[PDB]
């Protein structure tokens, strides 16, 4: 029924409803348990907490960025150090009682849990998160496609009975040769290539230690988690477009269409809920209005002009228009750039530096005087062409310098030809000039004064004359 | 005497040294439509 | 170097090819530096070098690296040029629909998967899915579902279907297409099918199928995933005076599509939220649209100026397009301009150039000659002095251009008599001088007129411009033959008063030797010009046969035509002399000169004739004068007689005699009466003079009033003019337009008043804007007649076919309104003009029809004759020169490469400005109608005979009682169907009625097999048919205006051709205008080039095709050389905007108008331009296939097939 994207825009986001401050702080809770699910099924690796502890140890010896390796704390380097020092004994325990004990004794599940338990009070800064989430993902996705790769090769039932516990174990490989039904010839064959599949798989196993049920399950709740966490990001967001658009409308007409300030204030907006903090105890538009402002601000200052003017310089220019709108109201008149300068405590040069980059390009279809059917695109001469008096003057002073240097011996002709790229691609040294002679280069030298000073004599430098 | 970047100069020079002969070529005009058709997404080539 | 122009849809993988790069930021120019930015709109590692043989780092910076990329940067160093050739490409990150095709009617997106375009819009504006793969589930391909019916079937089946929403969508379902078992089934379902709709549409979806299919485009091409970027110089962002920049739209566009681009590319990455996606792919769909075509989807953008950006297609589409603005037309070095003055010394190939305008425009040859003879070493030197205007530099100019012939063009220039080439002499001024006897011609007058000039630099240029472009050569109208170097005003006015005979005259009676003895005579003021005297003249003819007969004898005459007989070439009466010489004295007798002499005679005998009517016009002293403007005495008294008569009907109309509406009527009755009574006593009064003779009576002669001689002469003015200035004005009419019953009763010499001035100011505005918007008028039809016949060039000589027209005088009623002389003059006979009554052949089969065989056709009386025409000719290309006859512009049978439509097409256009029963002869009664038939032979009276004294053949005595012009042509060039178009006999049959339904009547007719034909007719119409009469084919049922196209398809070719002739020739008779038939028949034939097959036959076309009937009639020729069924055709009559936006070749139909159809449909379909007409080889630069090109075109054609062999 309508043609215009804003239209339907504002009917799919008016069928959400605005949220209460009770829903906020719920919508918040959810995504914190979400991340504590991630956070938690990224603990749960043994290769997770020695690179938390090794960057600990390089920034307690005050190598290493504090805030690079955490944000905050939970609370349900003063205070660092001794975490810290908790979280190694602590790893170091368990490390003691991983396996010595039993891996399904009491005394790892115990240790699992607390160490569980303690690293939940803990803020980590999004990038070493995104590193930790990352190398698990790719360890993930390796052994999907090679549990994908095996499947495809041997191509079921049979397989999923003895997948839960020997999908990677030898014992699978062993009882299928044993087998002995019709299609076991072309798999059996099949059943290299899966040696040859699962040869790669031990390794990766060795550096998890966990086979196969363990890392499925940790992929699992890693799922999860992250799937309540976008769910949850996802509804704050569709919640607070209306926020976004009522922030966006205000910078309209500023070389930004409505719907791009509307999508980077949405973008900014996600930033907003992916850094937010329900403990502080203010209300979510507070502290999305800034994202939202900054998102759109920024855009307007990257993305309104054809020649780019940086942010800070656009800034400048805004700063120093409100400065010239206030003293033109104060005296009445127009400020001149020495009181601008004065006023800004800047240098007057850098002012009508400032004062010659505000302009938009001209477009070429704007007509020109009173008339319509001209444009100005028709009064722009094209300045880089040669003219053809120019280039014949070229082809003449060609002709002339052949034939002023054929009333020469060949040998200070040819001289000259090399040492200036007469009828040759590259000009060249006085040695390659010397080099084909076998001469030096000081014979070179004084053969082209004497070409020259013969060619100063009036007798044979009349028509040369002409050119200049 | 219009579009023809070199056989305008072509033409000048030949002037210019008595011959009055040009060697017609393809104008820049035709060229920049041929551009223009390619830049709305339509395959527009000249046989040979 | 090419020979034909391939248009087709663009792959992916063919916009790469094209692409040196591609375009990953909006950023274009660094706001310091103003250095391109990388991976930018104006990158130079990818489009190329800002600077000559350099690097944007700067170290290669000369031409020893050519070709070399540079490390740092990746700039190739070369030249600059390649920046407006090199292409770059965006990756978009989501497929766009092409708005061409998918908006553009028909939607062939919506004709190829059969969905409505709102439901395709739903799609691709993100409202609801559509379903790609169905899988084992009960949906079908293609049918539409909303959000909630995908949630709920998602639930249902999960990842057995797969449904989408947008252009990923539309994609999805066009490649998983199968175009062949598409094909197939719409072929068998088309078999089976009755209903003429569905017909309609499942054969236009066949053929946008079969097309697809032949041209090996995929459908899934029609989306876009890879969008080309022109090259930055033809979209330049280049600094202006004073800092600032000038830029092109495209630039904002592209930039706001990359914007958008990266923004989806980013919310991608982020995993956003689905809706803000959807929005962003809407706002991708709708950059893009906007790019390729703005406004055409929604709302137009609009930059900083509160005005709508160019795109593309306006880029390439409308008047200020590329087509017409720099293809069609342009702007041309060696030309220049300036005001034009008269010079009446000049001959008729001379024009007057300035110095100073000659020395620019010529200065290159200046130079060659300057150093040709020594006079400077180099061209600098040349330049210098040149600058300098020494004497040597005047006198080389001199020498150059000697035998240079020039070109001079007015605008506009109606017909190619616009643009003529002279020979320039060298004039002290800055104004050009022109020929008086070319302005007819320019349609040019000095009262602040300008000129343009041109110079033709090569040697073939000059030869043309001396043989066929001369002004020496264009003495004949090439619209109807007449001669258009008539002399007027002065000349026409000196010869008019030289010629004239005076009553006791001094040197009356005188005895003249010849006259030489008549001029020694008025020189030494012995005798007037005017003097009645007798002259020996010695007279030459020369015959037809080409016998010279000099007879001397004595003829009674005036000393003034003797003295203009001594200028007269020798060949030609004493009597085109021997009486007063108007307009059309003087015409006549360069027309004889031009028939019994030739061209060079002609000319010279003009220029002596300006020469002398010039001389004798100033010595003649006619001047205007106040009393030269008699008002009769007659017409107050007619005044008050009128006035006195309207008081008394106001008196009856107090009565109540009469109504309103009848005084009226005879108040204006009276009133025109009245003005024709002063107009006839002041006509007499101006006329005539009483003088004195030699015997002193008082004798009747023609006054020699200055007025009454210009308006006699033809000179200047008219009867109506002189009835203004000393008698009435007349009554004049309302803006509406309903005249005032009091009339002006002043004239010009008295004086109006208020009233009257301001009365007369309501027709003078009107008059002036009809002027100016029927100027506009004329070149609309002018262009659209240009565009329909350009392709008509005359291919070959003879067809060898035996059809043609009948040509009989035109009758409309007792007299004739055209002889038939007229028509046939310059048309080649068709079967041999028998004697009537006998079997002699008087003149054979395939002669030109001259003046001769005219004069022995008129002394034959000779009734209908058939002559070949240009819409029966058999050539499958053009037409053929004996089909054609006599060019007008030349007298001679038409040559070969004669570009005649576009002749046509001038020729009816140009005068578009000018635009806005009793028996009275002895004879016979002859009936078919009624005819009245002299004893001669000739017919001589037609009359229509609506349904008598005498029968069939009997003798009828004389006196016996037997009993919105231009609009007009345009409708009747474009086929329009009129509002209440006649009812027509579609079969031969007896009527019949029938059941009287409601709403509208049926009728039934009998044909002579028994099968019964059902019509369908409105209840209010005036049936001439009755039940039980056997009407034939053609005969009118209901009477009205006939349609063109119900007369092509019920009566033939013949009929709607002398239709269309009649009535545009009608219409331009009404005003005086003389065009000759063969121009109207050149666009009726144009008309007449589709059929749509009726029988398909064995050859390679569907029933219900509209197609070339050239193509046909080779099919057919073909077939019946293979013996193999022919295929059926019925013609189909277009108007010329229809029949030239149907032509074969898309590039003159895209450069017409309606661009965006065109180059759709032509790139769905993969036409090919095989450049076979003149517009095409026009854009594209190459010689026209038309006069000095033709032979060339020719050979290439030769060794084309000889190398195909
Ligand atoms: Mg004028
Ligand atoms: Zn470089
Ligand atoms: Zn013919």
Known sequence: RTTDPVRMYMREMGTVELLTREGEIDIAKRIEDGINQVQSAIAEYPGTIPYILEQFDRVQAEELRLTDLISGFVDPPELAREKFNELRGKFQNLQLAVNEFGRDSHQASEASDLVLDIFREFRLTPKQFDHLVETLRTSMDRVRTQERLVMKAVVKKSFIALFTGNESNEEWLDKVLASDKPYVAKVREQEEEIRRSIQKLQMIEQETSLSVERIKDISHRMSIGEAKARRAKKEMVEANLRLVISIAKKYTNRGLQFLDLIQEGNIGLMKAVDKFEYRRGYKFSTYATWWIRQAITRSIADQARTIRIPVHMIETINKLNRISRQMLQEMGREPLPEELAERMQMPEDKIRKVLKIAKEPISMETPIGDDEDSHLGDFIEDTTLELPLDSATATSLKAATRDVLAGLTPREAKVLRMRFGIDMNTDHTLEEVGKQFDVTRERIRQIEAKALRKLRHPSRSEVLRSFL | KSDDVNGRTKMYKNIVDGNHAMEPGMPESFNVLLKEIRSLGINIELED | ?1205
């Open chain 3, 1 to 1205: 170097e090419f020979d034909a122009i391939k248009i087709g849809l663009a792959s992916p993988d063919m916009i790469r090819s094209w692409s040196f790069g591609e375009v990953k930021k909006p950023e274009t120019i660094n706001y310091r530096t103003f250095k391109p930015e990388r991976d930018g709109l104006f990158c130079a590692r990818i489009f190329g070098p800002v600077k000559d043989y350099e690097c944007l780092c700067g170290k290669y910076k000369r031409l020893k690296h050519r070709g070399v990329i540079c490390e740092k940067c990746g700039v190739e160093v070369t030249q600059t040029k390649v920046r407006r050739d090199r292409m770059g490409h965006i990756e978009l990150a989501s497929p766009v629909a092409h708005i061409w095709f998918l908006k553009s009617l028909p939607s062939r997106i919506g004709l190829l998967m059969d969905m409505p375009l709102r439901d395709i819009e739903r799609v691709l504006y993100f409202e609801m899915y559509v379903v790609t793969e169905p899988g084992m589930t009960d949906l079908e391909r293609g049918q539409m579902l909303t959000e909630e019916e995908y949630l709920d079937r998602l639930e249902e089946w999960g990842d057995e279907f797969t449904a989408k929403m947008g252009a990923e969508a539309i994609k999805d379902l066009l490649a998983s297409m199968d175009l062949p078992a598409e094909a197939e089934q719409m072929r068998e379902e088309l078999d089976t099918t009755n209903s003429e709709t569905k017909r309609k549409k499942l054969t236009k979806r066949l053929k946008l199928v079969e097309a697809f299919v032949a041209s090996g485009n995929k459908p899934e091409w029609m989306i876009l995933t890879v969008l080309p970027v022109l090259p930055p110089d033809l979209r330049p962002l280049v600094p202006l005076d004073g800092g600032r920049f000038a830029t092109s739209d495209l630039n904002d566009l592209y930039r706001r599509v990359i914007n958008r681009n990266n923004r989806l590319k980013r919310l991608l990455e982020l995993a956003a939220p689905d809706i803000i996606v959807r929005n962003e792919k809407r706002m991708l769909q709708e950059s893009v649209d906007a790019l390729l075509d703005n406004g055409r989807r929604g709302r137009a953008i609009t930059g900083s100026n509160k005005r709508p950006l160019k795109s593309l297609a306006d880029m390439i589409k409308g008047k200020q397009g590329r087509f017409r603005q720099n293809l069609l037309g342009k702007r041309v070095d060696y030309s220049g301009r300036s005001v034009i003055t008269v010079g009446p010394y000049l001959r008729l190939h001379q024009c007057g150039l300035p110095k100073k305008m000659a020395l620019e425009l010529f200065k290159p040859f200046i130079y060659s000659k300057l150093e040709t003879r020594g006079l400077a070493t180099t061209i600098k030197a040349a330049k210098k002095m040149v600058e300098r205007e020494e004497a040597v530099v005047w006198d080389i100019l001199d020498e150059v251009i000697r035998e240079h012939p020039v070109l001079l063009n007015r605008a506009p220039t109606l017909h190619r008599l616009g643009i003529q080439a002279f020979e320039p002499v060298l004039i002290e001024g800055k104004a050009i001088q022109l020929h008086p006897l070319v302005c007819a011609a320019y349609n040019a007058d000095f009262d602040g007129d300008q000129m343009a000039v041109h110079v033709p630099l090569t040697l073939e240029a000059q030869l043309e411009a001396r043989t066929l472009m001369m002004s020496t050569n264009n003495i004949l109208s090439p619209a109807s033959g007449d001669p258009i170097i008539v002399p007027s005003q002065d000349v026409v006015l000196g010869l008019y008063y030289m010629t004239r005979e005076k009553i006791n005259a001094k040197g009356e009676g005188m005895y003249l030797t010849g006259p030489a003895e008549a001029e020694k005579a008025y020189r030494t003021k012995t005798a007037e010009l005017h003097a009645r005297v007798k002259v020996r003249i010695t007279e030459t003819i020369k015959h037809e046969n080409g016998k010279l007969t000099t007879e001397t004898k004595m003829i009674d005459t005036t000393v003034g035509r003797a003295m203009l007989w001594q200028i007269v070439p020798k060949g030609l009466p004493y009597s085109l002399v021997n009486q007063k010489l108007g307009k059309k004295q003087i015409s006549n007798l360069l027309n004889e000169a031009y028939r019994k002499l030739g061209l060079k005679d002609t000319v010279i005998f003009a220029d002596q004739i300006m020469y002398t009517g010039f001389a004798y016009a100033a010595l003649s002293g006619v001047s205007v004068g106040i009393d030269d403007m008699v008002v009769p005495a007659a017409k107050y008294t007619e005044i008050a007689e009128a006035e006195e008569e309207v008081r008394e009907i106001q008196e009856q109309f107090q009565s109540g005699l009469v109504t309103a509406g009848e005084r009226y009527n005879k108040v204006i009755d009276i009133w025109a009466s009245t003005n024709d009574r002063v107009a006839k006593a002041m006509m007499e009064n101006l006329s005539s003079e009483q003088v004195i003779n030699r015997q002193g009576e008082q004798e009747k002669q023609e006054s020699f009033n200055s007025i009454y001689m210009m308006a006699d002469s033809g000179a200047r003015g008219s009867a109506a003019q002189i009835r203004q200035l000393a008698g009435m004005r007349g009554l004049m009419a309302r803006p509406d337009g309903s005249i005032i019953e009091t009339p002006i009763t002043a004239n010009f010499k008295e004086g109006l008043n208020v009233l009257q001035y301001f009365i007369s100011t309501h027709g003078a505005r009107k008059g002036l804007a009809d002027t100016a918007l029927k100027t506009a008028n004329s070149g609309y039809l002018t262009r659209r007649l240009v565009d329909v016949a350009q392709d008509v060039v005359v291919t070959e000589h003879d067809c060898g076919t035996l059809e043609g027209v009948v040509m009989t005088p035109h009758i409309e009623g007792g007299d004739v309104k055209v002889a038939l002389t007229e028509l046939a003059l310059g048309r080649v006979v068709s079967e041999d003009i028998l004697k009537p009554g006998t079997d002699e052949v008087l003149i054979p089969r395939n002669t030109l029809l001259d003046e001769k065989w005219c004069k022995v056709i008129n002394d034959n009386s000779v009734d209908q004759i058939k002559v070949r025409s240009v819409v029966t000719c058999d050539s499958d290309f053009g037409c053929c020169a004996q089909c054609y006859g006599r060019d007008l512009a030349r007298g001679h049978l038409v040559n070969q490469g004669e570009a005649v439509g576009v002749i046509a097409a001038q020729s009816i256009g140009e005068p578009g400005t000018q635009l806005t029963i009793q028996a009275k002869n002895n004879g016979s009664v002859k009936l078919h109608e009624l005819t009245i038939i002299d004893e001669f032979g000739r017919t001589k009276e037609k009359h229509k005979l609506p349904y008598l004294s005498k029968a069939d053949g009997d003798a009828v005595a004389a006196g016996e009682t037997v009993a919105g012009g231009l609009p007009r042509v345009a409708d009747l060039f474009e086929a329009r169907k009129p509002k209440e178009p006649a009812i027509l006999a579609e079969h031969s049959g007896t009527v019949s009625f029938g059941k009287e339904t409601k709403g509208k009547r049926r009728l039934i007719i009998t044909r002579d097999s028994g099968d019964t034909y059902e019509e369908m007719i409105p209840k209010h119409r005036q049936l001439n048919v009755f039940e039980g009469e056997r009407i034939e084919r053609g005969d009118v049922i209901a009477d009205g205006p006939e349609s063109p196209h119900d007369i092509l398809r019920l009566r033939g070719i013949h009929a709607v051709t002398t239709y269309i002739a009649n009535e545009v020739q009608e219409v331009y008779r009404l005003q005086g205008v003389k065009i000759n038939d063969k121009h109207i028949e050149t666009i009726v034939r144009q008309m007449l080039r589709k059929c749509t097959i009726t029988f398909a036959g064995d050859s390679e076309f569907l029933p219900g095709e509209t197609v070339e009937y050239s193509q046909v009639k080779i099919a057919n020729r073909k077939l019946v050389e293979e013996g193999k069924e022919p295929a059926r055709f019925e013609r189909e009559l277009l108007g010329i905007t229809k029949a030239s936006l149907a032509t074969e070749s898309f590039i003159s139909a895209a450069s017409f108008q309606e661009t965006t159809r065109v180059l759709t449909e032509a790139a769905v379909s993969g036409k090919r331009d095989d450049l076979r007409g003149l517009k095409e080889n026009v854009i594209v630069g190459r010689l026209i296939p038309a006069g000095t090109g033709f032979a060339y075109h020719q050979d290439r054609q030769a060794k084309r097939a000889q190398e195909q062999q």
